[PDB]
């Protein structure tokens, strides 16, 4: 009985809440700490990609 797994914390964090909201190339990634999918400041308004698309 574990098909449904209530999210308790979103991928973004309240500190990054809006740093994504109009940085449209924020791809979440693997969190080797958790195995979960959570954003990182290393890929947010990163003009590395913000033009690549």
């Amino acid at each position: 009985n574990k098909l449904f797994v209530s999210k308790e914390h979103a991928p973004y964090t309240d500190e990054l809440e809006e740093d994504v909201y109009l940085d449209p190339l924020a791809r979440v990634s693997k969190d080797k700490k958790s195995g979960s999918l959570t954003f990182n400041s290393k890929n947010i308004q990163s003009k590395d990609s913000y033009i690549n698309a």
Partner: protein, 193 residues
């Protein structure tokens, strides 16, 4: 020019708002040195007249072909066929243009990360974020809405380069009326006009 809706995630908790709309300002500031010419109309104009030629030379190379084709096929039951294809040509040639517009006049920013829809919602008319004179507010008189309906505005101007000293003027059409639950957006979309 722009309209949208937004939300964190699944129907999870109703009574609290948040960032959701800030995504109407998504753009990749990763490198802003080399200007994005797409915002300069002139650039967008040349591309257009350019293809127009292409759209123009295209028909002649096509209508000429109905000659060797549209009467070599049938009897002289001909202009009923020409009109059936010529019309189409003149039409296809049309639609084959008004697609160029939206690449160059309206929908020239959807497929660009480094231009949020909002600049492109306005740059399409030669406007700028610095001309968003006003902002009509949900303005409910809650501790948060008025508090969070106002933060966001800051960012989306803190993020699009609104000139320090170009605030936008809080209109609150609700002190008169109330909260029409689902009617608000009009009352405040009426005012606007």
């Amino acid at each position: 020019a722009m309209a949208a809706t937004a939300t964190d995630k699944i129907g999870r908790s109703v009574p609290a708002p948040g960032k959701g709309i800030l995504t109407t300002a998504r753009e990749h500031h990763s490198s802003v040195k080399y200007a994005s010419p797409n915002l300069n109309m002139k650039y967008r104009k040349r591309q257009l007249v350019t293809r127009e030629a292409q759209i123009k030379d295209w028909v002649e190379n096509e209508l000429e072909a109905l000659k060797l084709e549209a009467e070599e096929i049938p009897s002289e039951d001909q202009n009923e066929f020409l009109l059936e294809r010529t019309r189409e040509i003149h039409n296809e040639a049309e639609s084959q243009l008004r697609a160029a517009q939206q690449q160059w006049g309206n929908d020239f920013y959807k497929r660009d990360p480094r231009i949020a829809p909002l600049r492109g919602a306005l740059a399409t008319y030669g406007l700028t974020i610095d001309d968003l004179g006003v902002a009509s507010f949900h303005g409910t008189s809650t501790k948060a809405n008025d508090k969070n309906e106002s933060a966001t505005i800051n960012e989306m101007m803190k993020h699009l380069g609104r000139s320090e000293g170009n605030p936008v003027i809080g209109v609150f059409q609700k002190f008169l009326t109330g909260h029409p639950k689902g009617a608000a957006g009009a009352w405040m979309m009426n005012g606007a006009l």
